[PDB]
Amino acid sequence: ARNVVYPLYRLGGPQLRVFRTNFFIQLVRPGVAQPEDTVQFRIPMEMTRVDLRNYLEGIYNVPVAAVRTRVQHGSNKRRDHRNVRIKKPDYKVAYVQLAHGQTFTFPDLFPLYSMLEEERQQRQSSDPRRGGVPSWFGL
Amino acid sequence: ADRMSKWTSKRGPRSFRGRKGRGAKGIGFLTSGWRFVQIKEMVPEFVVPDLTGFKLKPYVSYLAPESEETPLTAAQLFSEAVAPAIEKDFKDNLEKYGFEPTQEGKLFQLYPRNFLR
Amino acid sequence: LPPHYRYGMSPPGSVADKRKNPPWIRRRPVVVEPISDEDWYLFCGDTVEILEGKDAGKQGKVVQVIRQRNWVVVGGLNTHYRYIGKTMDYRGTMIPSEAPLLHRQVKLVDPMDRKPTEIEWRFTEAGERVRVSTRSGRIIPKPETWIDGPKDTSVEDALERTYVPCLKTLQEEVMEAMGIKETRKYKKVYWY
Amino acid sequence: ARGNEYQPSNIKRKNKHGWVRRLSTPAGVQVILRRMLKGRKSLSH
Amino acid sequence: LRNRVTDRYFRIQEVLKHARHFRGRKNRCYRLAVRTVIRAF
Amino acid sequence: IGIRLTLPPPKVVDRWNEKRAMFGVYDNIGILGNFEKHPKELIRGPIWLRGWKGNELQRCIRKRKMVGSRMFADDLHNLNKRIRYLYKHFNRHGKFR
Amino acid sequence: VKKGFRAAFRFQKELERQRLLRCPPP
Amino acid sequence: FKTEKEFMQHARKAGLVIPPEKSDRSIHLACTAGIFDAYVPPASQVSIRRIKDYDANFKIKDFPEKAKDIFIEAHLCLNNSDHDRLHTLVTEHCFPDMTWDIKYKTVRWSFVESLEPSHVVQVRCNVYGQITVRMHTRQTLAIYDRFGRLMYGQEDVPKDVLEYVVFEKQLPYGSWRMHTKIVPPWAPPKQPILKTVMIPGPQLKPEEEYE
Amino acid sequence: GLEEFFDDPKNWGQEKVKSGAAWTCQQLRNKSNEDLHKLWYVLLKERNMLLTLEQEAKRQRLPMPSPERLDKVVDSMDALDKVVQEREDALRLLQTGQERARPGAWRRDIFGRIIWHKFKQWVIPWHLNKRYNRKRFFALPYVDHFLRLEREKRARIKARKENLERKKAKILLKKF
RNA sequence: CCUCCGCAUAAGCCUGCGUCAGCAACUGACAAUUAACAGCCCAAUAUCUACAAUCAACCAACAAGUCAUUAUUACCCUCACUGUCAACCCAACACAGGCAUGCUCAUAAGGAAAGGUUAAAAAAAGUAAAAGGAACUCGGCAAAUCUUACCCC
RNA sequence: GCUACCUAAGAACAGCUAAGAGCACACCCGUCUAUGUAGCAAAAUAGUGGGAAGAUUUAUAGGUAGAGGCGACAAACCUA
RNA sequence: GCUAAACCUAGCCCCAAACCCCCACCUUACUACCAAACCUUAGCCAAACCAUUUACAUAAAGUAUAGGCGAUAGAAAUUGGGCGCAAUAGAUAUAGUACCGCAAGGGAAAGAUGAAAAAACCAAGCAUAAUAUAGCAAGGACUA
Ligand SMILES: [Mg+2]
Ligand SMILES: [Mg+2]
Ligand SMILES: [Mg+2]
Ligand SMILES: [Mg+2]
Ligand SMILES: [Mg+2]
Ligand SMILES: [Mg+2]
Ligand SMILES: [Mg+2]
Ligand SMILES: [Mg+2]
Ligand SMILES: [Mg+2]
Ligand SMILES: [Mg+2]
Ligand SMILES: [Mg+2]
Ligand SMILES: [Mg+2]
Ligand SMILES: [Mg+2]
Ligand SMILES: [Mg+2]
Ligand SMILES: [Mg+2]
Ligand SMILES: [Mg+2]
Ligand SMILES: [Mg+2]
Ligand SMILES: [Mg+2]
Ligand SMILES: [Mg+2]
Ligand SMILES: [Mg+2]
Ligand SMILES: [Mg+2]
DSSP states (O other): OOSSOOOOOOTTOOOOEESSOOOOOOEEOOSSOOOTTEEEEOOOTTOOHHHHHHHHHHTSOOOEEEEEEEEEOOOOOOBOSSOOBOOOOOEEEEEEEESTTOOOOOOOOOOOHHHHHHHHSSOOOOOGGGTTOOTTSOO | OOSSSOOOTTSSOHHHHHHOOOSOOOOEEEETTTEEEEOSTTSOEEOOOOOSSOOOOSEEOTTSOOOOOOOOOHHHHHHHHHHHHHHHTTOOOGGGGTOOSOOTTOSSOTTTTOSOO | OOTTOOOOSSOTTSHHHHHHSOTTOOOOOOOOOOOOTTTOOOOTTOEEEEOSSTTTTOEEEEEEEEGGGTEEEETTSSEEEEEEOOOSSSOOEEEEEEOOEEGGGEEEEOTTTOSEEOEEOOOOSSOSSOEEESSSOOEEOOOOOOOOOTTEEOHHHHTOOOOOOOSOOHHHHHHHHHTOOOOOOOOOOEEO | OTTOOOOOOHHHHHHHHSHHHHTTSHHHHHHHHHHHHHTOSOSOO | OOSOOSOHHHHHHHHHTTOTTOSTTTTTOHHHHHHHHHHHO | OOSOSSOOOOOOOOTTSHHHHTTTTTSSTTTTTTTSSOGGGSOOSOGGGSSOOOOHHHHHHHHHHHHGGGSOHHHHHHHHHHHHHHHHHHTTOOSOO | OOOOSHHHHHHHHHHHHHHHHHSOOO | OOSHHHHHHHHHHSOOOOOOOOOSOOOOOOOOSSOSSOOOOOOOHHHHHHHHHHHSSOOGGGHHHHHHHHHHHHHHHHHHTOHHHHHHHBOTTTHHHHHSTTTTSOBOOEEEOOSSOOEEEEEEOOOEEEEEEEEEEEEEOOBOOSSOOOOBOOSSOOEEEEEEEEEEEEOOOOOOEEEEEEOOTTSOOOOOOSSOOOOOOOOOOTTOOOO | OGGGGSOOTTSTTOSOOOOOBOOOHHHHHTSOHHHHHHHHHHHHHHHHHHHHHHHHHHHTTOOOSOTHHHHHHHHHHHHHHHHHHHHHHHHHHHHTOOSOSSOEEEEEOTTSOEEEEEOOEESSOGGGOTTGGGSOOOOOTTSHHHHHHHHHHHHHHHHHHHHHHHHHHHHHHHHO
């Protein structure tokens, strides 16, 4: 869990246990070409590699073999009308290699106007022989 | 030369980039040869129940009726938790009813929290 | 939203709003008269009557209450004419958009007398509060299915009282439920 | 060659101007107090 | 400013109406027009 | 062009306002109320200049010695500097002497 | 915005005189 | 742009994501996109009762009189550009179709006496009444410029006009207003225009040839 | 499995998905702690699903199908955590009489202001903790002038706000 | 056609010429740098550590030197955290300047002195120059050739 | 964080003749000329030059603070 | 006819009243975790230099006193909301932000539609429209 004071461990103490997990997770699509057995996550900062292993083993029951995380610096180079730096937030990225010869591909997610489009059919464009005469009049 | 930027771990020289980390937690200790010992019991075990046959979905149907907020004060939890035990053992040592004066020998202590969350 | 944000016909989070109210404008704040939260009496669905200007004396129905500016948007009445869908070559279409009214410009309607009425918040034994007109002693009410998906609880299962109130924590109750055992007792640390 | 002057390093910046040094002496404590009374966003390096 | 001058356009136009036929910036700018209008008088 | 293009909104003044209509009442509360009060007790303002007129040096000396104990700190410091400047000005600079 | 009425009034009348001498009425 | 799809695809390529937001106020329209059933010129009494059950005092034997007075008065408001009257006299589907191109030009339309008794033709039907009226009149047009020089039709000479004017009514406060005007494909062409027109051919790119 | 990071694949690209209400708090006070534990993991997996679908919505430059149900899930997570912490607070008040789960003390920093010092866990006692005994919790007498300047600065901000409220009241009486 | 540069690491900077869209690297959205390299170390209490380095051998020194344990007790878990991008830093700048080290010492790497034209004066840099060869000038300064001798300090 | 001196623990110095030696790179400095003078530069450029195994040069951290420091005294240097 | 002009209200000032305000953070602040504080202010300046000296309710009273008895200093007993500002103004403040500085520190500028945007005229400077012998650029004039 995150934003929680962890109880201090002395030698021979009980197992440190988290019951209601504070931190979430999201698996993003890889923007670069990666091996077929690798799932890329966006860990929130206070979550280590061991915690991500036991997190995916416990909750989602995924046979996770390797985890390699890294920290992404969101850019502090964009500015207000006040000329004040806006920081896009930094985020930790997990790279997960799966066991048992499993293979993951990110699935292909995401595969009144009657009046408007029925006046876009009846637009009745001005014939060039009219020369700007309004075509409403029956004369 | 910046002052406004947060002093992150990406920023100093090698000795500064080594010591400061993110909001992660310590799992073990360093020994000679800089060899990291990972203590098994410091790792949080995600205690996860069985989600089989469990009939609570993440949303509630709109046909559920509206009620009032009654936060659990100490008098309510004493009342429904302890008060019929006192009334049944009074019509015929406070530790008999679920009271513990001290909790140093207790596993999950209430003050201070030695459990997590 | 910035201070002295100017409320308008668009909602305070839309896109054409951000064309109209970008984060760098500082405009003269509209002096609106302070109506109390209990003093407001025009609701989204009341049949009201316009007193002033165009469409005076007509009765319509409130469609939107923009309460931060004492605004009542009568549907189909007090309309001006704007185009929409105007591309580069096509001139758009004509639409009767609706101009908002201050609540001073609006009076309610008895559902049996059909007249402009002043309304007070009279108290009765049957109902603690409700609108009561003054020209007649008549109560105006307050104006105004579902199929579950695979991810909704039933109503009965959302209201099960499976809570036996006990002096055990969530942690002790789940450790007793899961059958997890622990013999290592916790060792006292120092807090300062 | 003149004007290059500022020759940066983070160790000399934190150990010259940082918070722990400003709280090492009471003069720098009064510096931090003038920063908070003026209202500045960064009280120290 | 408690009371600062409002009627100042008309003093400038008191002087500058006599300069309307001069050359240069004497017909336009008040600093030059005062000297040439005094001098013309 | 420092002049306005439209005429300003009109200035309505109610001459029979509560303040204007009853203005000046109980100014002669001494000379026909058996001298129980003085009209300098009828004025409201700063406590250092109820019933007193002085120039600026006198207003600041009197302000300091009457309410200067509970003044704010940089108001007390600015006021000490104003008394020191106005001392150096009234007593050393000037034409007539 | 300089408070007052009299310079705004006189300048309002000289704008009226320039509107006359620009577009003279029939 | 040219359509909604180009603005949406440039909203996806530019990255400008517009979430569809839900507002409780929708547009209270007072028109139709054209005609419910287009009358074709050379039994619908159920729709007449479908007008009389909302209106409760409605006489078709008095209606082509009023259809005349709604017609002519609306065209009189083109002589004066009285748009405030026109939105009471004409629908919103008709108002750009008769007032847009006449902007920045003075028309001097003038009615003179009709040739036939005007008469109802068909009637069809949240609830939108619709009455098509046959008129055969004598009108005079004179459409001028910004510069006040004649470009369509003499002011004196009357012309005889066939008119299939479609009316629509909102069925609590609306009245009968000109909705559309059916022009039939068998009709003769209008007046010729005073000036000549050049019509350009295909503007050729250098690699292209004219065929 | 990894398919629980996604919803029912019939919902892919529908641009509108029906969902129920959020778990309000009184509906959760009727439940057991085991039931709030399992429901915590239900809402946890649902929140992760909706967050992957948000980030893929930002990736494909497309809008959300229904962004309101992520707000429903965050509201149900916060409601469940609040109900659990209510039971923690009530049981703590019964057993120990404490109102804060973490011990601390009202202290006074170098800067003279009074700050709630939340205690950290330590192994050794505080008198031989080398890093703790450098952290000084006393204000020396050069601070009291700055405390007085802070007091006067906050009093100026307060007087400005109160007077400005009175000016708005006067302008409201002038207009209506 | 240039290259006395380049490629890395250190320090610095903090996403700053990646994708999509909007004289002739800016904005919005999205994405990425993945530890084996490098930081982040060490259980006490006593007890040991006279003989440089320079190919360390002859030698040859003086300025006299950069490198190590033992006794007993305690000890059994293990691979976490952080850095990793760029055309970059300090000089107000897309500045002929300043910038440590390891490699290549002409490059396998990196770049373009000319927007186009004409061929004035004056100016800058250069190449050549008859005869003479310091006559110039404060002074052989500059340039070209390289040299003799004597004073002062 | 420049610069004056110092502390700690580091580093670089090709080739040729044969030591605070000589020729000579890198590197340090800046004699003399010319360009530049709101410049490329709030002191540079091009060439010529002095030194280049030593009282050398240099990276990193630390120390000395203004009634002062520091100084192979130029009354220098101590953020143009 | 371009640049532009204008604008009224954000706010502020002076009074009165009333005594105010989850997590991480003194190690390299924003980092889960190991053997000590008090010590006269001085000086500018006035004395036409300077050197002792030089101010920091009413009334007695500028009195007694003190003082290179000179500049000057100086008691006590006793007595008892706005004839404010309105965007170069008013706070520096839209903000102690941007930016500058190694740091202490310094320190900005600005906005104006309408009920609803789900609807002209006038500063300088130019342009329309270059110039004609001669001279502080005018004045007397003149048919010009
Ligand atoms: Mg340096
Ligand atoms: Mg190359
Ligand atoms: Mg080039
Ligand atoms: Mg050229
Ligand atoms: Mg020759
Ligand atoms: Mg000679
Ligand atoms: Mg000669
Ligand atoms: Mg020479
Ligand atoms: Mg030598
Ligand atoms: Mg010389
Ligand atoms: Mg040499
Ligand atoms: Mg020296
Ligand atoms: Mg000397
Ligand atoms: Mg000298
Ligand atoms: Mg003097
Ligand atoms: Mg003197
Ligand atoms: Mg007394
Ligand atoms: Mg201001
Ligand atoms: Mg200012
Ligand atoms: Mg002009
Ligand atoms: Mg003359």
